[PDB]
Design a protein around this ligand. Structure first.
Ligand SMILES: [Zn+2]
Ligand SMILES: [Zn+2]
Length: 74
């Protein structure tokens, strides 16, 4: 964990924080958006998907993309 509130900190407050790692999302790292209106770290997701092929937020089974994006289905 983190403990040591000290020094001047200037980090715009937001209402969006990862669920797997629980760390303020950063632009430097790519963000993957899910069909459940939930975004996560390209790493957090990929990994979390291995141990649990579900969303750590809504907890919905995301195996196949229902939406008709491309003929890459079959
Ligand atoms: Zn994360
Ligand atoms: Zn979700």
């Amino acid at each position: 964990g983190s403990s040591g509130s000290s020094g001047k900190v200037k980090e715009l407050n937001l209402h969006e924080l990862c669920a797997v790692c629980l760390e303020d999302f950063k632009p430097r790292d790519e963000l993957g958006i899910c069909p459940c209106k939930h975004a996560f770290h390209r790493k957090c997701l990929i990994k979390w998907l291995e141990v649990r092929k579900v969303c750590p937020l809504c907890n919905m089974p995301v195996l196949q993309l229902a939406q008709l994006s491309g003929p890459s289905s079959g």
